[PDB]
């Protein structure tokens, strides 16, 4: 906004985005599906939920 050899001035525009939480969850586990093998009419088959 101003530029002398002994003086300066600047302006900065900052925009902020604050997420407001509804609930916070701390003690958490990841799921790992393993399933089960089934041997049916000769064929081996992997079964999963």
């Amino acid at each position: 906004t101003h530029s002398s050899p002994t003086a300066t001035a600047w302006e900065i525009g900052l925009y902020y985005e604050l997420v407001i939480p509804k609930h916070i969850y701390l003690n958490n586990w990841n799921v790992v599906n393993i399933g089960h093998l089934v041997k049916s009419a000769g064929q081996l088959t992997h079964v999963t939920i």
Binding site: H36, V38, S40, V47
Partner: peptide, 17 residues
């Protein structure tokens, strides 16, 4: 149309000695 197998993830049930 026959009834098929049942699975219940019980290890103790499938023990072989």
């Amino acid at each position: 149309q026959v009834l098929g197998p049942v699975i219940d993830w019980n290890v103790t049930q499938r023990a072989v000695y």
